[PDB]
Amino acid sequence: MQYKLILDGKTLKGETTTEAVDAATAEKVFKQYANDDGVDGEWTYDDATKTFTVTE
């Protein structure tokens, strides 16, 4: 399944995607991506749109 990540960081904003078997797996992929880009924030998830948001 496709999942989307919205980054609402102080110095990085935008969106990316990944393909994952479920949302728990997508969450780990996205949390690694965000950490690698220095984005530390609060994570929220909307299942209807398969979209994570990280807000710094």
Swiss-Prot record:
UniProt Sequence repeat ranges: 2-56
Subcellular location: Secreted, Cell wall
Protein name as annotated: Immunoglobulin G-binding protein G
Organism this protein belongs to: Streptococcus sp. group G
Residues of the full protein shown: 303 to 357 of 593
